[model samples]
Target: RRRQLIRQLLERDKTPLAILFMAAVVGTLVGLAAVAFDKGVAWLQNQRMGALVHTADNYPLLLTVAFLCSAVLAMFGYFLVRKYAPEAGGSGIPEIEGALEDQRPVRWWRVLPVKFFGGLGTLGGGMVLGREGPTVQIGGNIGRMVLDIFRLKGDEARHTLLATGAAAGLAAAFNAPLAGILFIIEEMRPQFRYTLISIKAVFIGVIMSTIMYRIFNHEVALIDVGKLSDAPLNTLWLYLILGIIFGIFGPIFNKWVLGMQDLLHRVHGGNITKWVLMGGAIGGLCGLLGFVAPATSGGGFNLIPIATAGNFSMGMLVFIFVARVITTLLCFSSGAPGGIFAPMLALGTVLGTAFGMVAVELFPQYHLEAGTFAIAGMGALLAASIRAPLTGIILVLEMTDNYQLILPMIITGLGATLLAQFTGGKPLYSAILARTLAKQEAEQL
Candidate 1:
């Protein structure tokens, strides 16, 4: 037909240059959006407690105001998603994968607005969530929106743009272009159609997005632990042991999260009121904890350096680790539109630091820096939980700006992934997406 002829003509004239140009546009938009997203969440974080702290001279009244503000913010986030787009909930990277798989619908019309504003609310409410998840979802939605606007048709174009947007989103998040490209190749391999053509587009998108992110956010590594001594080969086993501990913890963590999701499903029975209230309670408590024990709340980004620098004793580090695990579980498993990625990195650092302390004590000759273990553990949790070892390692390297530790990072990530896999842990995001799809089908039936 005429459509087919037009499509043929479009394909014949399409060039790598055109794709790269479009990718630059995607990167620029994603970078601006990512920076805005981070700053907006930070504003929310301060605003949620700023007015309350002003009244803290009256303790009871301050607590009440704090709870109410956080409750309202959390409810706002929940209402947006439940009312407009349920698919926007949780780490949206998996949703992007599902979209690429053609196993789930994008519904960008609802997701874009829901994810953007809803993320601001939950993250701003002092919840333990990462902004990257929402940012990625938004970027992917932008891709689809652009395709629709331009009237671009076909699977190749659709998939290519989606992948490009996601890569750019991650690049903008960390200003780590190479890491972003590797993430597509490693984490989303099933959906990523690897080709010479695609890699070029990804490169272009990541470079531009990283540049924009740097221009706005500066070129600082997202987490600054300062450089630590090289992890000696003798100390490598300690990291593996650390990874094994994470391996045991990771699968159990994923199970608890999934169980919580199912439990919430039964508690709410698909009712919006229950969902919003449950999410609000978690959010409100997180807000309160942010004041009480700042290290134990939020996404744990700030906690990483303090924990890694041998600042906390073994017992205190363990306490914070346990506390953060609970908070991360409750907030993330509550179905917030945020990523546990940052929180996981924090957990790994704590445990890794603990392990390093023990190793140093047992063998005084090793002369270890607990901070090195922090680097190793930084990516281990992601590997174990997500089963994306290479992506986790590369991402840690990218964010830490510690290329020399790549070997340790790889070993730690691989150990975690291997142990988790052997322990029967499925990839966290895949499980969540599968659950989502199953529920969607059941509802339709």
Candidate 2:
């Protein structure tokens, strides 16, 4: 077979042609899905906010409208997931991991719609969540959906396309094509096969999705914090300290999230009505919080609006960071159809800025800005929790366009990852995957 492939390669091999072509199709499909998902969430936000605007003059009416509208929307999302596609709940990334290992079923037909609209309701209802999680799941399912349609019969075929879609999906979400490919190679490393054919498909898939994303949403960077000043070597030490801070915080965060999820499960006890009502309670609270601070009481990240350290006091940034961290745990742990990526990024920005302000005061000789630290810290939490530095580093680099700060970014990420692991903290998604697999095992027996 090797000799035959060598001869064919010299004459132009077709071994990987079908897989490559199929991956392109999957990437294009995921791109469209990602764009549609973004549009849908934005549309829902406008409609809900418009209603609140009409009632703003009347305080009593506004409060009532806020809670009711968001509560109803959130309940709709929970209702769909619990009733039809339970797998669509929470960040769907772990579910994809399980699917890749064949520990769980794909159920693409059910998940595609459930996650799309379900995500729209939860994310759009002003919950503290991110957009990429659903797209990753949606991406993987699209891969499966395409394979089924084409009647592909091999496990290798199924695996390649599934990974292809997932990579494209991540790319579509952030418009960071390189980060998406690295995510599959790094974050999805355990399951992704390192072969020329599959890698080619993954690369091709990301390009297509990136192209589509640019076509629909021409936004240059996903979370623009502006170009930050370069970090001097003297200040690089400070970033490692900041990474240590996140390293401690990262495990705590993972514990908080998983613990809340466990408590919520017990509180609801598998009752659909109770679960949805719980979602409504969170969403309704967030809806009311909208008045306190735009959309989320602590949700709409204040990085840019108050990006400069001069505007917000050190104490104020910390307060906001603490508030959003709790709010994020509340909404995300309740099994809402959203990702923690954006919320975590927001927290890191706030905390990083806070750390930078304090650090500057501690060492008056260096003369540093918090925004630089903010950029470095943005990806640290992700690296620590997810245990994928390359993906985390590239994700922030591409999203922020701060190519110059790669050194600090790497140091912070390394610091966090080392501490998180040293303290015996598991990767967030894999931990979630274990819980579900156990549940699946218990039920079958």
Candidate 3:
């Protein structure tokens, strides 16, 4: 009787296939959300730019309006986040990281709407940010929200569904299904217990997300840099050299960000007014810079191709790089509801372009395209900053649709990540989440 009851329970209660089916359903919905968010951002960006350009026939008026529009939009974003959910600020990756650890809570109640609209405002405001991080957060929240709505109150259902949502979110954001799956497997490995049940569910979710993305986004490479020839084995050291440069700078960048946030925290003293003014100032500057030199501002996606096109001299490339570093620091440190992913990608391209040009200058006989270095650099910075070299390489390869360059991309990314890790640089998102949770604990205590 006991054995029969155990068998009956196993047969009736084990719902592995059902769980995977739900993952597919979640992926399809989140994929649609990702596509819609991407398009929505583009539409808003174009509308703002068109209006500013058309009205800028009067230069001063255009300048003033652009600054104020961006500032107001940024303020609006800051206000939404501050008033509704401060946790939604920054890349939102850390929050997902925190959720996976069960160290922090997932109040999808506030984060989903706030992150989506807040992200739309900041990114659409022409600030340097990426949607991948935000989308992942949104996707995870959706998963939790679904669980809550259905009153599925088991740890297995909650954790499995959240991971599915996050993977689906990434797939939708970049239309890169494999990268989406790998991100969870590699980056979240510490938190994600790899089980047969979870792995199959993740696969089903990614497939559904990819299908939905293709239906609307049409499977185009997100960043289109024509594939160039591979870097000769001899040139591999050059990537390491590039990695070294980034390794040092990556830690410094994180240090400065933490310092800046601390300073701002002291200055604001938790006053909402001070925070609003800070956002306005940073956003206004970015808005003005956009008009002065379009390449120096925005999300840095457009800047990559333009920079890598070899249209600029080494001196010009260096100049834009410095300018962007300042803008990136200012915009990101202000606690906006955006991401540093694209900005870092742009930074890598500039550094890579600089390296490639120098390489060709030294060894003209080798005949290299500076553009290829740009491609390698695209992933290198991400690897160093995020400390997820595999995801960096795969994400860039998927976005650029250059599967052939995977080896070189891996080398550069691995080099960067190893160096960054050796230098004791924590993953940027992990660092951010620590700060958030620390603050919450202090306040609660």
Candidate 4:
């Protein structure tokens, strides 16, 4: 009787104190989880590489051992997802989007465990995946978990908490609170139930998550590209050109992603053993590639500064770009519990650098820096492919701290989005969610 009375009062209260409290809880938990996940991946990677560092002289032995280690680690992730929670695979953002629409079930009980440990296995093995996708999904699941524990009754509370958790997760992953909020407001506007209370919960969640992130990681730009020169008004046209290029490439990239997924499906033919073995083999090959060309493997975050600094020769930059494209396609499309965001960012950086270099050669009067293009292109592919220009723009701005280049970045992002829409490029997460729904319907039938 007492519990019912409290619960009823909590739901009917106009103050929204209960929801705010829950949002804080979700943010703190997600923040801790994100840090733990980062540490876990680092520990595993070091463990995998610790002995290999000493065995550099023994190339054959080092290569063989590295391959075996990564294969086993990646296989563990694939097995977990295949066996227990298939929805935990891939970027997981689409799943959250579906859940916000109430079109998909939030199996927090299954997803939380599978995504957490499964992400550790895959990302720790040096796969080409980002932490943002898994972190966002985990955050959303955590919100649902909180709701269930608290016995929150209203659909309003349920939806608000879910959005808050996802926002907190993105904030935790990138330490970009504004980007997290904008991501929900812009990218998820269709699904997010916008209310004064819901917006407040999101703000509270992002604030708490960011504070937690800063406690452990400190206050530094996530990418740290340093202060960059401003983009000239005259050169803004170049950014538009770059955006159009990405707009054309964006749909093509999405098609290739879907195609690779289909190819993986055909290769495994829904056989769990075959899927795991194929994932292991892919992971093994990436491990070997790391030894030969370190930049071509892993999540590619470390490569950002290197590429932007122009350390590599022009030809080498293009080569690495092409190589990573293939590797990224293979790893992400294979459904081994990873993300494509970091890999795509790396690709965008390389391509942008190459374009900048060529422009310097062709237009000697401008004296343009390649790093400027790198920054602009960093968010271009994301905006074009994902169709979330605001999130992409703010995310890159927050990560790189090159606010002066905002004009160029916005020009590039908006141009890419416009052209992508004109070219019939669907938003990546929405397409993924649609496919997931179709599959569910087919199974039910």
Candidate 5:
């Protein structure tokens, strides 16, 4: 029956089986890359920690070793991007966006190794970054590589395969297949050449990638929030209010991110040595802070469950939120080859949980659980910042395994998007792409 369906679709729509076949290959390769990246970071972090454990007798020595190890690792990441693949720096998502629009080059040979090994350094050094962006870039690069290897010609196949790889990358990163599909369909809607064949290719890519992920990685939720309580219809208004808060803050955050980039450029003065050394200093600081306050450093993935579980007081949550905002800005804005996705999500959780605590106090009538609000606000930043509300909502829903809060998620996401646009905040990825394009043009001259 499945074979017949494929035949019928091929006959009816002229869908090239080669595109679907290549998408499956892209998905599988992306899944493997995602697993390797995750394991590489984990292994490096463990080694760093293990080394520090032996120096437990001397506090100063242990701290120094920790700082040096992380600093050196992060420096290597900065060096790789600066020396070989400059486009591999930061999230790498913007580069993919540029490639999709034919506005930038995709040097897969350089990008693949640079991103893979460079991501190992930054993420392994415990920088406040997310894997999704790197994975997305890696996946796209791999897709292009596959095309080149197979000698697949034509614009349509190239575009479809690239989109498939991107979606597969997201799916593998977070184990969210639906979110992966929606990301390309919604977030990349402008660049993606929407068609029956292209959409089918994306679906095939996501399916294969998910299967590969499940095979090599644990089947647990990326964010194991368990089952959260459903928000009552009457209390849905609070989510909108939360969205409004994020909407106001989103553009300000983006400005800070961009400003930090400019500040770093000035400080480094376009020198490679200075750039790497500055990254080392920043990485060393984070390493030291990891020992002092674990919550204030790293990617903040571990902090999510703890924060939403109400482990900290309102004051403490606010403090961590502020600290992370600074750390996230320093690490991500400095172009250490990392993504801000997880860090932003962590920020949203902390603030949302704090707000929930306040709302619970104000209205004992609603019987609101702070966790519910945490779930709602999980994607609010993505909605407001990236301007991809549906993707944010679905991604969070998929990650947390909390299907009960769909309506609240939609309301919160949409509200955030609505106000963010009204307030003149541009989409985060597009803004980054624009910056990259301008830089490219200037460099060409």
Candidate 6:
């Protein structure tokens, strides 16, 4: 009954022009913010340890400098997050998700700077982290910042403003406009209050955000997967098999992630110093792994095409995937102001490529392209783990332009969630928000 009154009031506003125009501005601003965020982080990497590449011979001196340089850089991010703004820490997709539901405070004043500089250090140091989460968090803050400038009235409108930026957040970060809208519609389904104007505003903001991004980056897909061949009807069954495997893998991986966080909680015992040191240790390891392989580190943006190209032997793929999973756990579970999405996508890409190679060997008649399987895995992992199959499918669909593989992707995406659901596993971001809320509540008492 109370909710209905607010809805009426919001709907009753004459013209709804301000809300729509703000959404447009919010969307465009977020796009450039994402652009600046990524470009600045890359700049940091070039000067930081990326410089070490030019400085040395090959192995010993190079690895040492890489380790120490990244160790210090990772420490910078962790220290700032721990000391200045704890909210800016770890897979901040959960933070923005929590904020949408109003369970967590939106602290743009503290968070924006810390997350900006801090994310640069950790991500640029080549930790298995993604700017995707930071970009979303940053976008939300920008939306909230606008609400303040307006001195707006309705709490619901304020809420509306925040979510609109989140809508733009994922869109600009990945250059997947529709996926951005669907991420909110699907992943944030529980938190979103459906209003005709609000949804319209969402569409407006996402479009504006994308227009701004394209103005700078050009009309290029983020993944650059090229136009891949279609999956044969017979080969479609192979996708389901891969989905089933990812289904089992998703739940177990989530448990490991949560378990690692709890273990880290025990280790730190509310101490920022301990948390900072641990982050440095994990980052140092990331630097070492990256220096040695270059394949196992970073967000895997460069590695995806290579992985999908069927470059590795089965054993090598298995090893790199396992190594990446370990490194991912280290960076994400330790709370380094980065995202798991990039690393998870990388994991799926490598594993899918390996699976496809084996499938090719098993059924020579299929003449399958392993790259097709790699694309399916890109969505399947998100579907199973995050439980947002539509977002996963559309994201990969738009990112790669492999519209031809839609059928295989459908089976892969849906088949994945079927088993992930069977285990009664919670969606990953939802679970992370729940944990944060619990801890936040306990702290108040």
- In terms of TM-score, the best-performing candidate is 4
Could you tell me the TM-score of candidate 6?
A: 0.94
lDDT of all predictions: 0.79, 0.82, 0.80, 0.84, 0.84, 0.84
TM per candidate comes to 0.93, 0.94, 0.93, 0.95, 0.94, 0.94
User: Per-residue alpha-carbon lDDT of model 2 for 250-335, expressed as tens digits?
Assistant: 88888988899898888878878777888888888877776556623533443443653346777777677777777888888888
TM-score of model number 4: 0.95
**Model 5 off-target regions past 4 Å?**
1-15, 191-193
Model 4, 262-320: lDDT tens per residue?
88888777889888999899988888787667888877787888888667898898788
Model 6 steric clash pairs: 130-339
Measured over all alpha carbons after superposition, the RMSD of each candidate to the real structure, in angstroms, is: 4.1, 3.7, 3.3, 3.2, 3.4, 5.1
Clashes of 1: 0
> On a 0 to 100 scale, what is the lDDT of residue 251 in model 4?
91
Ranking by TM-score: 4, 5, 6, 2, 3, 1
The weakest ten consecutive residues by lDDT in model 4 span 186-195
lDDT of 4 at 376: 87
Q: What is the lDDT of candidate 5?
A: 0.84
Clashing residue pairs in candidate 4 (N, C-alpha, C atoms within 3 angstroms) = none
- Residues 234-285 of candidate 5 have per-residue lDDT tens digits of 9989988998999999999989888898898888767887888988899888
Those runs of model 6 whose alpha carbons end farther than 4 Å from true positions after fitting are 1-15, 191-193
Number of colliding residue pairs in model 6 = 1
Winner of 2 and 5 under lDDT: 5
**Count of backbone collisions within predicted model 5:** 0
Task: Tell me the tens digit of each residue's lDDT in model 1 across 88-183.
Answer: 878888788888788777767878777888888888888788867988888777777766667665777788888888888877776677778887
